[PDB]
Amino acid sequence: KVQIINKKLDLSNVQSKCGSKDNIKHVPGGGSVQIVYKPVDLSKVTSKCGSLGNIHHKPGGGQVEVKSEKLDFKDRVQSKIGSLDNITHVPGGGNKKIETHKLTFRE
Amino acid sequence: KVQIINKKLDLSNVQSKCGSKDNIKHVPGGGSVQIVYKPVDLSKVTSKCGSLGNIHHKPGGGQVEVKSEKLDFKDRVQSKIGSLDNITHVPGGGNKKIETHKLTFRE
Amino acid sequence: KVQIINKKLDLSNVQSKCGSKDNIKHVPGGGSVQIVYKPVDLSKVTSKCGSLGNIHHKPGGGQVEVKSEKLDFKDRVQSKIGSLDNITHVPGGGNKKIETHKLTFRE
């Protein structure tokens, strides 16, 4: 009766880089709406019920409401732009990622 | 009775780079709506019920509502643009990704 | 009866870099609304009920409400821009990530 087990994950939710490295840029001249909706939502619902069990699982969702009624721009909207986002994203390293995962079993 | 098991994942939800490396750019002259809807949604619903069990699983979804009523631009909308997004994304590294996954079993 | 187990995760929710490395930039000339909605939401709901058990799980969701009624820009909206975001994101290190995960079992 020699029992030997190596096991990584049995019941797991792994979420990496969720809503990540994000640039949201707005240059309105006039009358502009920008909307960004990033729900990162995670649920383990384990449920045991019965016998007239009245379960009402109701996660209210998000709401966005916009009402513009009176908007007038009588004369002038002018946008003179030179330069957005001068980005040198320079990864210059000759990196070494050594990832040892070694599995020795002598029975 | 020599039992030996190596096993990585049995019940797993892995989510990598979800909604990732994202650029959202708006240059409205006049009267513009930009909408971005990134729900990253994850559920393990384990349910055991019965016997008049009345289950009401209702995750409200997201809502977006836009109402513009009065909008006038009587004279001038002008957009003179030189340069957006001067991006040198320079990965210059001769990287080494060493990934050892070795499986030794001597029975 | 020799029982030996190595096991990493059984019941786990891991969330790394969630809503991460985020730039939100607004340059309105006139009359602009910017909306960003990042809910990072995590739930382990373990439920055992019954027998006229009336469960009302109701997480109110977020609400966004915008009402503009009187908006007039009689004469002039002018936006002269030179430079946004001069970003040298310079990772210059030849980094070494040594990740030893070694699995020795002598039975």
Side-chain angles (χ1 to χ4, degrees):
Chain A
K1 296 186 170 193
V2 193
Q3 161 61 279
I4 168 62
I5 289 174
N6 172 34
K7 63 189 180 70
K8 208 197 173 171
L9 319 186
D10 285 16
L11 286 164
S12 185
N13 309 358
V14 185
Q15 294 73 23
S16 165
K17 289 195 173 74
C18 321
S20 308
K21 312 215 197 181
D22 308 323
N23 306 340
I24 299 159
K25 309 166 177 125
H26 203 175
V27 186
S32 316
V33 47
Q34 208 177 55
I35 297 171
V36 171
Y37 190 87
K38 317 175 168 179
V40 186
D41 315 329
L42 239 131
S43 163
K44 285 189 189 283
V45 164
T46 317
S47 282
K48 158 62 198 70
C49 188
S51 153
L52 305 93
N54 313 321
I55 313 311
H56 299 241
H57 167 88
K58 179 176 157 48
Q63 281 196 357
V64 154
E65 300 291 330
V66 156
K67 297 165 180 61
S68 300
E69 316 166 0
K70 186 178 289 294
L71 271 163
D72 56 285
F73 303 76
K74 292 291 184 69
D75 209 324
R76 270 184 180 277
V77 184
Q78 282 189 327
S79 306
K80 286 179 193 163
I81 289 171
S83 342
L84 274 72
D85 303 315
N86 302 347
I87 302 182
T88 73
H89 183 140
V90 191
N95 317 273
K96 284 63 169 180
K97 271 205 185 182
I98 295 90
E99 301 292 327
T100 307
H101 287 266
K102 75 99 169 185
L103 280 303
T104 46
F105 313 81
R106 306 298 87 76
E107 298 79 326
Chain B
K1 296 186 170 193
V2 193
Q3 161 61 279
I4 168 62
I5 289 174
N6 172 33
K7 63 189 180 69
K8 208 197 173 171
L9 319 186
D10 285 16
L11 286 164
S12 185
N13 309 358
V14 185
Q15 294 73 23
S16 165
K17 289 195 173 74
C18 321
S20 308
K21 312 215 197 181
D22 308 323
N23 307 340
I24 299 159
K25 309 166 177 125
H26 203 175
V27 186
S32 316
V33 47
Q34 209 177 55
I35 297 171
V36 171
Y37 190 87
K38 317 175 168 179
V40 186
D41 315 329
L42 239 131
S43 163
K44 285 189 189 283
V45 163
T46 317
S47 282
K48 158 62 198 70
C49 188
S51 153
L52 305 93
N54 313 321
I55 313 311
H56 299 241
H57 167 88
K58 179 176 157 48
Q63 281 196 357
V64 154
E65 300 292 329
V66 156
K67 297 165 180 61
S68 300
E69 316 166 0
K70 186 178 289 294
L71 271 163
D72 56 285
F73 303 76
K74 292 291 184 69
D75 209 324
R76 270 184 180 277
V77 184
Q78 282 189 327
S79 306
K80 286 179 193 163
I81 289 171
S83 342
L84 274 72
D85 303 315
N86 302 347
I87 302 182
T88 73
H89 183 140
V90 191
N95 317 273
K96 284 63 169 180
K97 271 205 185 182
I98 295 90
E99 301 292 327
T100 307
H101 287 266
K102 75 100 169 185
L103 280 303
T104 47
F105 313 81
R106 306 298 87 76
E107 298 79 326
Chain C
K1 296 186 170 193
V2 193
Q3 161 61 279
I4 168 62
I5 289 174
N6 172 33
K7 63 189 180 70
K8 208 197 173 171
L9 319 186
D10 285 16
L11 286 164
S12 185
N13 309 358
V14 186
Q15 294 73 23
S16 165
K17 289 195 173 74
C18 321
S20 308
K21 312 215 197 181
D22 308 323
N23 307 340
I24 299 159
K25 309 166 177 125
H26 203 175
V27 186
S32 316
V33 47
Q34 208 177 55
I35 297 171
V36 171
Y37 190 87
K38 317 175 168 179
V40 186
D41 315 329
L42 239 131
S43 163
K44 285 189 189 283
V45 163
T46 317
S47 282
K48 158 62 198 70
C49 188
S51 153
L52 305 93
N54 313 321
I55 313 311
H56 299 241
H57 167 88
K58 179 176 157 48
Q63 281 196 357
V64 154
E65 300 292 330
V66 156
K67 297 165 180 61
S68 300
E69 316 166 0
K70 186 178 289 294
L71 271 163
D72 56 285
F73 303 76
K74 292 291 184 69
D75 209 324
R76 270 184 180 277
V77 184
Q78 282 188 327
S79 306
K80 286 179 193 163
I81 289 171
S83 342
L84 274 72
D85 303 315
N86 302 347
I87 302 182
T88 73
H89 183 140
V90 191
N95 317 273
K96 284 63 169 180
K97 271 205 185 182
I98 295 89
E99 301 292 327
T100 307
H101 287 266
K102 75 100 169 185
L103 280 303
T104 46
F105 313 81
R106 306 298 87 76
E107 298 79 326

